[PDB]
Design a protein around this ligand. Sequence first.
Ligand SMILES: OC[C@H]1O[C@@H](O[C@H]2[C@H](O)[C@@H](O)[C@H](O[C@H]3[C@H](O)[C@@H](O)[C@H](O)O[C@@H]3CO)O[C@@H]2CO)[C@H](O)[C@@H](O)[C@@H]1O
Ligand SMILES: OC[C@H]1O[C@@H](O[C@H]2[C@H](O)[C@@H](O)[C@H](O[C@H]3[C@H](O)[C@@H](O)[C@H](O)O[C@@H]3CO)O[C@@H]2CO)[C@H](O)[C@@H](O)[C@@H]1O
Length: 366
Amino acid sequence: SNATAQQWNKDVVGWNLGNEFECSAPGQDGESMQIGNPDGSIHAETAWGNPVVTKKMIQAVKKAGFNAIRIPIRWQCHITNAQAMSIDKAWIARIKEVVGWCLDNGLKVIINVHHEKWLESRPTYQYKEENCQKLALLWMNIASEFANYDSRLAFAGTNEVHIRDNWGKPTAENLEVQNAYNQIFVDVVRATGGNNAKRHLILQTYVCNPWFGIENGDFIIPKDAEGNGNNYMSVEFHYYQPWSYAGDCTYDYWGDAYKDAGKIPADNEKTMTDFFDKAVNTWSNKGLGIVIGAWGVTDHYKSNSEKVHENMTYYCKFLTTEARKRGFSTFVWDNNHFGNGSEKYGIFDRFKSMKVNAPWILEGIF
Ligand SMILES: OC[C@H]1O[C@@H](O[C@H]2[C@H](O)[C@@H](O)[C@H](O[C@H]3[C@H](O)[C@@H](O)[C@H](O)O[C@@H]3CO)O[C@@H]2CO)[C@H](O)[C@@H](O)[C@@H]1O
Ligand SMILES: OC[C@H]1O[C@@H](O[C@H]2[C@H](O)[C@@H](O)[C@H](O[C@H]3[C@H](O)[C@@H](O)[C@H](O)O[C@@H]3CO)O[C@@H]2CO)[C@H](O)[C@@H](O)[C@@H]1O
């Protein structure tokens, strides 16, 4: 009925329904900050080249072993009225259909506000008043539409807030605005009462980089509703680390265990568990949940695919299990892209009956 953040997160190893409901409107620039409802936008789940989601696809993520699905959702091209941030009824009905598929199959769900560029790209004093008013109206409508779902459904308020093409440390200005987003989100969802009084709410660090929130109280823990304390909130970050493995393909190998295979980044097993410990001390020990809302290693190999895919299996095992035994939930990124380079995070092929074209990832977890 009312699970706490830490209860909800416990043993949750999940999966992202990536590049589906967070696509920009058909034929629109993904960086665009425009709010409206272009014709055809109801079909935007195919705009980036992935299929219409079906029940069978959800069921295959279950059967693989996962127990939660995070659903990224863009809202800005589904707004019937930009002043009030009203949401296209058919878009809501479509989201509920997919959420219902997950819940009917014993999956926990995260729904969020993802690639919402009028919010993510303008964390500045100039746009604060407008972004805050619009975030409130948007979440007022989302929270009210999903008020009657039980606690298996959590809300994450935003995704990666940052100035465009800028992945560095926020300014004081950027931090002030983005922390204000998290507070507004909490206030608005709690003010709809009902099952939202104690629904698991997920808050983000700046650009979902843990290092931009873990120091100096950079990340501000919001004031929740009276008596809730911190027990019904989590801190979310994304953990594509070290970015040299996993991200930009500088190294093909990771860990002291695989030093004999090739060259490895300085960040090893210890730098990871050190960090996880530091997130326990900063946040968990205060009663907050910890959600790793995105992680993964992009499929990339110079020479010896076997040896690289084995090290990837060990990376996936080490990350999931070390997170799990500290009470974190994990959600692996999947964009349904396969190959050898950047942004090759596909696990299942969504065009071929959900066939597992990356068994080495699924060997790492599970
Ligand atoms: O190929 C189809 C479209 O791809 C777009 O890039 C997306 C990537 O495919 C997707 O893997 C990436 O996922 C992000 C995720 O959204 C973010 O929250 C997380 O923290 O990191 C992941 C890895 O970067 O999202 C991007 C969208 O920004 C192209 O931008 C698009 O042109 C193309 O049609
Ligand atoms: O939308 C794709 C864009 O991706 C950019 O790469 C950034 C990643 O999206 C982001 O996840 C990563 O965050 C790293 C951080 O850089 C690193 O210091 C730390 O160790 O881990 C963080 C999370 O794992 O940052 C990179 C950029 O530094 C591309 O740079 C961009 O071209 C592309 O459009």
